[PDB]
């Protein structure tokens, strides 16, 4: 039970950081497209 809860936490944070990364740095690639394409 403890280890499934801890894996639960590691998955939730891997998703959270993945969301932050994808959002921010897709905004970055949007700037890339707008200002060099």
């Amino acid at each position, epitope marked *: 039970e403890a280890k499934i809860a*801890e*894996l639960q*936490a*590691t998955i*939730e*944070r*891997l998703t*959270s950081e993945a969301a932050l990364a994808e959002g921010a740095l897709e905004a970055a690639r949007r700037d890339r497209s707008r200002l060099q394409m």
Partner: nanobody, 98 residues
């Protein structure tokens, strides 16, 4: 030859996502290699061939050994892990030329 590694401190084998980072100076952060307790092996698009992950459960440490000399890998480093999902971070090291 060619050399690199890190270590760890506390409550080993809580080794969920335990990942390396690297920062060329005057750039953003960056994650390089990820290894967990379950013998996972995945890297950044640049260090396949260039690198390796290792995991010594004995002396509370994770290893990453450089290969294929090329200077650009020079940077300030870090080697962290995840535990209850808490942001964990360290200090790092540098790399070289020739």
């Amino acid at each position: 030859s060619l050399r690199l590694s890190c270590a760890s401190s506390r409550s080993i084998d809580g080794i969920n996502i335990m990942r390396w980072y690297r920062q060329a100076p005057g750039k953003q952060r960056g994650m390089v290699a990820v290894v967990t307790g379950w013998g996972s092996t995945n890297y950044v698009d640049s260090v396949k061939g260039r690198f390796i992950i290792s995991r010594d459960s004995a002396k509370d440490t994770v290893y990453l050994q450089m290969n294929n000399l090329k200077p650009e890998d020079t940077a300030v480093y870090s080697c962290n892990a995840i535990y209850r999902g808490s942001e964990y971070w360290g200090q790092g090291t540098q790399v070289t030329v020739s």
